[PDB]
RNA sequence: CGUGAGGGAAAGGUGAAAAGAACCCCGGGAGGGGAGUGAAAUAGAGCCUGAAACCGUGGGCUUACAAGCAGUCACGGCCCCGAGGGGUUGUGGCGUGCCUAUUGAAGCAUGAGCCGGCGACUCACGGUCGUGGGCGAGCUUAAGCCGUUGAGGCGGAGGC
RNA sequence: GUGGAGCCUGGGAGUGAGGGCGCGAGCGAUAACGUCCGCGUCCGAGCGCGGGAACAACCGAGACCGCCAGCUAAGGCCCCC
RNA sequence: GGAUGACCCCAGGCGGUAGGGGAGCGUUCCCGAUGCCGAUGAAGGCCGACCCGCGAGGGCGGCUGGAGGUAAGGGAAGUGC
């Protein structure tokens, strides 16, 4: 704290409480006791745990009938309205939130600005994103790499 | 069901002839009569006892040698101001007070106990001035 | 001396009970027989300058 | 109908003035004026003026009749205090509060 | 006529038309119950020894409730012992139907 | 994140002060003095519920006594007699009788004199 | 503030917009009362909200024969709201502040004028028990590298 | 003898200023609201409740809450009560 | 008893300082949330003799206030004077 270390007044005989300096947390304007300092909240969750979590996350959406794999994306070539077309053809009105996993950039860029769509490259597949969304939509290309990461 | 509480009732006047009675033994009974504890609707927080006229206080009686040995005592608040008055002398100078002081000490202390002492009227000699209330002559 | 000092803060009730004698009494006034104005008795009327039924002082 | 005046921030002490205000509560306008005139106190000046402003309002803004007017309410409030140093013996400084008043007079009409 | 009846460990003087709260009775609201009798009074006088044999008072149960909350508080000095408990005693509300003497 | 006192403390003092409404001087005005007063009031309360059960019984007893000595016996003899008779009317109810229904009470007196 | 080295504060908020109140009235002024502006002026500049201590006016109840840790329990009177509640308190019963420190405090032992806000068991890395899970004669990566731009993976050196 | 009994392995303590009373001793003066031990008890922590005028440790008794119900304990029952 | 916190019946325990253990209340912040409550009135402030909870509290309603607030379930602390 910015203040100095001087004893503001003598120890005895003033008729006031004894104090040292005004950096003491007991003073308004003094330093704070056990406040936060910078911290690293990260830790190494076991790899196998992450893997099972990734398996189960997808498996859950499968049991729900919510997992859908697609072969390709028709005429969607970067324009959002194109995705919306394709969406409809596959049952995606947007009454349900979707996690779209594909390596095709132009599909991701199209679908991205939507409120109800989250977009991922397959190496980015992760369980928080899986649980967040009501429906899982994966390119075959993606499903293959998801396969590699879990076995 | 909550306990009965009387409405303010008319107090009976009562007459007692103190002649020849024992000082303290008369006293307890006057106190009881003053509280009103002889009344089934007794209530401790209101003045509802009887009024008591007493005559012949000067001819009250006491046992043992207390005539010369009962000392009544009074402190004035000044240094050396504790006067001592033997029973004999109190009879001879303010006889009615012997009975009064005895009764006073047997009533509860506090504002209510002090008003019940007022309801007691003590006379030396055969007579009193309370004809107007036509007091009922009790035995005790 | 040993610097006497109050032992307890005085209650609102007791400070105000000390003040139970502090009320001002209204000034005592009588009409002036000439100009009817209210004035202290036994003083020269400061409105019209009369006292004792004659003009005494220039108001 | 009522008419009022308030003198806010008068540099006199609330407790002192109230003494004077106590004299006029419930008097006719004529009586209070008389009383104030011969009250040997500083605050009688200030109360006089708050009164006269109120009577002005009553007559001139509120269709009341000067000759029906009476002090229906009057009260003194305490405003912000002025803090000043009063230097004492042996290096010590005391702090004097120079106190302040918000003076109010409220006039009504006495019917009949 | 009145009757002295005994319910919930306590006794009460009751009469036709009387509303009474007593310790909660195990009885559906609207139902009817017979209270034991210790003494009948008024015109005739019969003294129970302790109860009277033929007698009973009928009561229609109006319903059950919880009383106004009492704050039961505890405190011990120089020990930091303090407790605050809230209490509402259950009751049953009865109307006295008849004194079957 | 920092959690200042904010709103919480005021609301705790108010709770107390309301409970203290009606107390003299600072005892309804200062939070601290209220709390002292309320500890007393709480132990006084609890104790006085207990004590109230006693207090009334003692009044019931004094009352039964007066109406007993109207028929030539004392409370102590009375209670003995009812006891032998098997009359279990409580002192609360006896008292109502002694004032409200003096005939019925006299009867109870009768039975108690009989029972010994 | 200190000779000096040096110490070292307090102090944010009208309104959407100044539309910041022409003009008249009392006043020396301050201040106010009207008029006016504004959705709002106890938003009027001593300006969002406006708690508490604290001071005041008005109203109900109450108090000048009364003995008190100030309450509580009972009853009665008066006042308010409409077989009930609320306020007040005459009488009666009971009744030794809080905290701290102590063998023991109402204690004539400590601390506290009162109110508001600040104010004291934390975090990192190791360790040891317990616990929720992953794998199991196995378990696990560190720095780093790649990818993301709040996406995760690789990395077996090493540790148990 | 099934008890907030007992034993074993581990985690967390606090305490390591006691005090009155009864009995058995030493010290002192067959002194101290004295001191130091032994067995016990209560207070400590039961300064909650009844009795002892008032009073931690004497007598009665181990307070979960509510009731305008009943029986008792010590102690009491002429009035205060 | 039903079958595993569904509730019911019966029985016992429930004074407490140091201290051990258990279960909760609330404050700031994050996920829930491109959501939802909000000018037909956010937060906060002042009331209530009303409701729910053993309690810490949580509702509801009237007045003030004038633009924010944030659920079920979880996460993290500058968390209660
Ligand atoms: Mg520094
Ligand atoms: Mg500096
Ligand atoms: Mg420095
Ligand atoms: Mg330094
Ligand atoms: Mg130094
Ligand atoms: Mg220094
Ligand atoms: Mg010193
Ligand atoms: Mg000092
Ligand atoms: Mg000081
Ligand atoms: Mg100091
Ligand atoms: Mg110092
Ligand atoms: Mg310091
Ligand atoms: Mg220092
Ligand atoms: Mg410092
Ligand atoms: Mg420092
Ligand atoms: Mg700082
Ligand atoms: Mg600063
Ligand atoms: Mg700073
Ligand atoms: Mg701090
Ligand atoms: Mg620190
Ligand atoms: Mg520090
Ligand atoms: Mg830290
Ligand atoms: Mg860092
Ligand atoms: Mg950690
Ligand atoms: Mg790390
Ligand atoms: Mg979403
Ligand atoms: Mg999106
Ligand atoms: Mg007699
Ligand atoms: Mg009594
Ligand atoms: Mg004489
Ligand atoms: Mg006496
Ligand atoms: Mg007494
Ligand atoms: Mg001297
Ligand atoms: Mg001197
Ligand atoms: Mg000298
Ligand atoms: Mg001096
Ligand atoms: Mg002093
Ligand atoms: Mg004061
Ligand atoms: Mg006052
Ligand atoms: Mg005084
Ligand atoms: Mg004249
Ligand atoms: Mg004068
Ligand atoms: Mg004029
Ligand atoms: Mg001062
Ligand atoms: Mg000053
Ligand atoms: Mg029963
Ligand atoms: Mg019940
Ligand atoms: Mg204690
Ligand atoms: Mg204490
Ligand atoms: Mg105490
Ligand atoms: Mg304590
Ligand atoms: Mg202690
Ligand atoms: Mg305590
Ligand atoms: Mg409490
Ligand atoms: Mg704060
Ligand atoms: Mg704080
Ligand atoms: Mg607060
Ligand atoms: Mg608090
Ligand atoms: Mg608040
Ligand atoms: Mg609160
Ligand atoms: Mg009061
Ligand atoms: Mg007060
Ligand atoms: Mg006061
Ligand atoms: Mg106040
Ligand atoms: Mg109780
Ligand atoms: Mg008691
Ligand atoms: Mg009992
Ligand atoms: Mg007899
Ligand atoms: Mg018996
Ligand atoms: Mg019996
Ligand atoms: Mg210097
Ligand atoms: Mg200088
Ligand atoms: Mg310096
Ligand atoms: Mg400073
Ligand atoms: Mg600053
Ligand atoms: Mg603004
Ligand atoms: Mg602005
Ligand atoms: Mg002008
Ligand atoms: Mg002018
Ligand atoms: Mg002007
Ligand atoms: Mg004006
Ligand atoms: Mg103006
Ligand atoms: Mg307008
Ligand atoms: Mg509007
Ligand atoms: Mg306002
Ligand atoms: Mg405003
Ligand atoms: Mg201001
Ligand atoms: Mg604003
Ligand atoms: Mg303001
Ligand atoms: Mg203000
Ligand atoms: Mg205020
Ligand atoms: Mg007043
Ligand atoms: Mg007298
Ligand atoms: Mg009087
Ligand atoms: Mg006394
Ligand atoms: Mg009574
Ligand atoms: Mg009452
Ligand atoms: Mg009432
Ligand atoms: Mg009392
Ligand atoms: Mg006691
Ligand atoms: Mg005391
Ligand atoms: Mg004591
Ligand atoms: Mg305290
Ligand atoms: Mg403390
Ligand atoms: Mg302390
Ligand atoms: Mg000490
Ligand atoms: Mg010491
Ligand atoms: Mg000592
Ligand atoms: Mg004292
Ligand atoms: Mg003292
Ligand atoms: Mg000292
Ligand atoms: Mg002290
Ligand atoms: Mg010391
Ligand atoms: Mg000071
Ligand atoms: Mg104060
Ligand atoms: Mg404070
Ligand atoms: Mg720790
Ligand atoms: Mg572990
Ligand atoms: Mg694993
Ligand atoms: Mg190692
Ligand atoms: Mg045990
Ligand atoms: Mg054990
Ligand atoms: Mg066992
Ligand atoms: Mg631990
Ligand atoms: Mg240790
Ligand atoms: Mg220790
Ligand atoms: Mg020692
Ligand atoms: Mg030792
Ligand atoms: Mg020892
Ligand atoms: Mg021991
Ligand atoms: Mg002793
Ligand atoms: Mg012996
Ligand atoms: Mg011995
Ligand atoms: Mg020995
Ligand atoms: Mg000798
Ligand atoms: Mg010793
Ligand atoms: Mg000895
Ligand atoms: Mg010895
Ligand atoms: Mg011992
Ligand atoms: Mg200790
Ligand atoms: Mg004991
Ligand atoms: Mg023990
Ligand atoms: Mg006693
Ligand atoms: Mg005792
Ligand atoms: Mg005792
Ligand atoms: Mg004891
Ligand atoms: Mg027990
Ligand atoms: Mg009941
Ligand atoms: Mg018995
Ligand atoms: Mg015995
Ligand atoms: Mg005795
Ligand atoms: Mg007796
Ligand atoms: Mg049980
Ligand atoms: Mg248990
Ligand atoms: Mg316990
Ligand atoms: Mg447990
Ligand atoms: Mg909180
Ligand atoms: Mg919580
Ligand atoms: Mg913040
Ligand atoms: Mg943040
Ligand atoms: Mg959001
Ligand atoms: Mg939002
Ligand atoms: Mg809406
Ligand atoms: Mg609007
Ligand atoms: Mg509104
Ligand atoms: Mg909030
Ligand atoms: Mg907030
Ligand atoms: Mg609330
Ligand atoms: Mg609000
Ligand atoms: Mg905004
Ligand atoms: Mg939230
Ligand atoms: Mg939540
Ligand atoms: Mg979560
Ligand atoms: Mg802190
Ligand atoms: Zn003249």
From Swiss-Prot, chain A:
Quote a single Gene Ontology cellular component term: ribonucleoprotein complex
The protein's PTM annotation reads:
The N-terminus is blocked.
A GO MF label: rRNA binding
- Is rRNA-binding included in the keywords of this UniProt record? yes
User: What's an example GO BP annotation here?
Assistant: translation
Protein origin, superkingdom: Bacteria
Q: What keywords would UniProt list here?
A: Ribonucleoprotein, Ribosomal protein, RNA-binding, rRNA-binding
Description of how the protein assembles with itself and partners? Part of the 50S ribosomal subunit.
Q: Which family does it belong to?
A: Belongs to the universal ribosomal protein uL4 family.
State the protein's purpose. One of the primary rRNA binding proteins, this protein initially binds near the 5'-end of the 23S rRNA. It is important during the early stages of 50S assembly. It makes multiple contacts with different domains of the 23S rRNA in the assembled 50S subunit and ribosome. Forms part of the polypeptide exit tunnel.
Tell me what this protein is called. Answer: Large ribosomal subunit protein uL4
From-to range in the entire protein, with total length: 57 to 207 of 210
UniProtKB/Swiss-Prot annotation, chain B:
Question: What are the GO MF terms of this UniProt record?
Answer: mRNA binding; structural constituent of ribosome
The scientific name of the source species is Thermus thermophilus (strain ATCC 27634 / DSM 579 / HB8)
**Record text on subunit structure and interactions:** Part of the 50S ribosomal subunit.
The record's Gene Ontology cellular component field reads:
cytosolic large ribosomal subunit
**Is the Ribonucleoprotein keyword given for this protein?**
yes
Role description: This protein is one of the early assembly proteins of the 50S ribosomal subunit, although it is not seen to bind rRNA by itself. It is important during the early stages of 50S assembly.
Highest taxon above the source species = Bacteria
- Record's keyword terms, sorted: Ribonucleoprotein, Ribosomal protein
By what name is this protein known?
Large ribosomal subunit protein uL13
Family membership noted in the UniProt record: Belongs to the universal ribosomal protein uL13 family.
Which Pfam families did the record assign?
A: Ribosomal_L13
GO biological process terms, alphabetically, are: negative regulation of translation; translation
List, alphabetically, the PROSITE patterns matched.
RIBOSOMAL_L13
Curated annotation (Swiss-Prot), chain C:
Tell me the domain of life.
Bacteria
Which is one Gene Ontology cellular component term of this protein?
Answer: large ribosomal subunit
Q: Which GO terms describe its biological process?
A: translation
Q: Which InterPro entries match?
A: Ribosomal_bL32 (IPR002677), Ribosomal_bL32_bact (IPR044957), Ribosomal_zn-bd (IPR011332)
The record's Pfam families line, in alphabetical order, gives: Ribosomal_L32p
Region named Disordered: 1-29
Q: Ribosomal protein: is it a keyword of this entry?
A: yes
For bias kind Basic residues, which ranges apply?
1-22
GO molecular function terms listed in the Swiss-Prot or TrEMBL record: structural constituent of ribosome
Q: How does it assemble?
A: Part of the 50S ribosomal subunit.
Q: Which PANTHER family match?
A: 50S RIBOSOMAL PROTEIN L32 (PTHR35534), LARGE RIBOSOMAL SUBUNIT PROTEIN BL32 (PTHR35534:SF1)
* Stored NCBIfam families: rpmF_bact (TIGR01031)
Q: What does the UniProt function comment say about this protein?
A: Found on the solvent side of the large subunit.
Q: Which HAMAP family match?
A: Ribosomal_bL32
What's this protein's name? Large ribosomal subunit protein bL32
Gene coding for it: rpmF
Curated annotation (Swiss-Prot), chain D:
GO terms assigned for molecular function:
rRNA binding; structural constituent of ribosome
Q: Which CDD domains match?
A: Ribosomal_L22 (cd00336)
Q: Which GO terms describe its biological process?
A: translation
Can you cite an annotated GO cellular component?
A: cytosolic large ribosomal subunit
Q: Which UniProt keywords apply?
A: Ribonucleoprotein, Ribosomal protein, RNA-binding, rRNA-binding
Q: Which Pfam families has this protein been placed in?
A: Ribosomal_L22 (PF00237)
So what does this one do? This protein binds specifically to 23S rRNA; its binding is stimulated by other ribosomal proteins, e.g. L4, L17, and L20. It is important during the early stages of 50S assembly. It makes multiple contacts with different domains of the 23S rRNA in the assembled 50S subunit and ribosome.
The record's section on PANTHER family has: CHLOROPLAST 50S RIBOSOMAL PROTEIN L22-RELATED, LARGE RIBOSOMAL SUBUNIT PROTEIN UL22M
- State whether it acts alone or in a complex, and with which partners, per the record: Part of the 50S ribosomal subunit.
**Stated family:** Belongs to the universal ribosomal protein uL22 family.
Designated name of the protein: Large ribosomal subunit protein uL22
Q: Per the UniProt entry, what species is this protein from, by scientific name?
A: Thermus thermophilus (strain ATCC 27634 / DSM 579 / HB8)
């Amino acid at each position: 704290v910015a203040y100095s270390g001087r004893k503001i007044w003598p120890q005895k005989h003033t008729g006031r409480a004894r104090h040292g300096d005004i950096g003491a947390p007991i003073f308004v304007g003094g330093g704070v006791v056990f406040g936060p300092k910078p911290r690293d909240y990260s830790y190494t969750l076991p790899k196998k745990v992450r893997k099972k979590g990734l398996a189960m996350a997808v498996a859950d959406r499968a049991r729900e009938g919510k997992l859908l794999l697609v072969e390709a994306f028709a005429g969607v070539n970067g324009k959002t309205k194109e995705f919306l077309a394709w969406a409809k053809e596959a049952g995606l009105d947007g009454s349900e939130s979707v996690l779209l996993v594909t390596g095709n950039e132009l599909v991701r860029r199209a679908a991205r600005n939507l409120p109800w769509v989250v977009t991922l490259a397959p190496e980015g597949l992760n369980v928080y994103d899986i649980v967040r969304t009501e429906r899982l939509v994966m390119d075959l290309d993606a499903w293959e790499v998801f396969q590699n990461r879990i076995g | 069901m909550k306990t009965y509480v009387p409405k303010q009732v008319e107090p009976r006047w009562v007459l007692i002839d103190a002649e020849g009675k024992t000082l303290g033994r008369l006293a307890t009974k006057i106190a009881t009569l003053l509280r009103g504890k002889h009344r089934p609707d007794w209530t401790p927080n209101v003045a509802m006892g009887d009024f008591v006229v007493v005559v012949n206080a000067d001819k009250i009686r006491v046992t043992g040698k207390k005539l010369e040995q009962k000392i009544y005592t009074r402190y004035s608040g000044y240094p050396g101001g504790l006067k001592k008055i033997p029973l004999e002398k109190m009879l001879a100078t303010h006889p009615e007070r012997v009975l009064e002081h005895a009764v006073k000490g047997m009533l509860p202390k506090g504002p209510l106990g002090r008003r019940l002492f007022k309801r007691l009227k003590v006379y030396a000699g055969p007579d009193h001035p309370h004809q107007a209330q036509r007091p009922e002559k009790l035995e005790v | 001396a040993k610097h006497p000092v109050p032992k307890k803060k005085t209650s609102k009730a007791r400070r105000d009970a000390r003040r139970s004698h502090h009320a001002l009494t209204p000034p005592t006034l009588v009409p002036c027989p000439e100009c009817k104005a209210m004035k202290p008795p036994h003083t020269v009327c400061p409105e019209c300058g009369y006292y004792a039924g004659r003009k005494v002082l220039e108001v | 109908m009522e008419a009022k005046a308030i003198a806010r921030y008068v540099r006199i002490s609330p407790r002192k003035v109230r003494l004077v205000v106590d004299l006029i509560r419930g008097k006719s306008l004529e009586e209070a004026r008389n009383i104030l005139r011969y009250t040997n106190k500083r605050g009688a000046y200030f109360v006089a003026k708050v009164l006269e402003s109120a009577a002005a309002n009553a007559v001139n803004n509120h269709d009341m009749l000067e000759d029906r007017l009476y002090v229906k309410a009057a009260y003194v409030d305490e405003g912000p205090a002025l803090k000043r140093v009063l230097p004492r013996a042996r290096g010590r400084a005391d702090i004097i509060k120079k106190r302040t008043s918000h003076i109010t007079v409220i006039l009504g009409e006495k019917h009949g | 006529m009145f009757a002295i009846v005994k319910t919930g460990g306590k006794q009460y003087r009751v009469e036709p038309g009387l509303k009474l709260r007593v310790e909660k009775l195990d009885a559906e609201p609207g139902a009817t119950v017979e209270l034991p009798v210790l003494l009948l009074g008024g015109e005739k006088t019969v003294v129970g020894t302790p109860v009277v044999e033929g007698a009973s008072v009928v009561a229609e149960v109006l319903g059950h409730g919880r009383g106004k909350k009492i704050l039961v508080s505890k405190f011990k000095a120089k020990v930091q012992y303090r407790r605050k408990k809230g209490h509402r005693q259950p009751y049953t509300e009865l109307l006295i139907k008849e004194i079957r003497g | 994140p920092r959690a200042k006192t904010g709103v919480v403390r005021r609301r705790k003092h108010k709770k107390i002060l309301k409970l203290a409404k009606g107390y003299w001087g600072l005892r309804s005005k200062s939070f601290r003095k209220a709390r002292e007063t309320l500890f007393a009031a709480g132990n006084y309360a609890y104790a006085h519920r207990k004590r109230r059960k006693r207090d009334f019984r003692r009044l019931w007893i004094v009352r039964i006594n007066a109406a007993c000595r109207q028929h030539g016996l004392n409370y102590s003899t009375f209670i003995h007699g009812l006891k032998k008779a098997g009359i279990e009317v409580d002192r609360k109810n006896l008292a109502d009788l002694a004032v409200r229904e003096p005939q019925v009470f006299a009867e109870l007196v009768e039975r108690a004199k009989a029972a010994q």
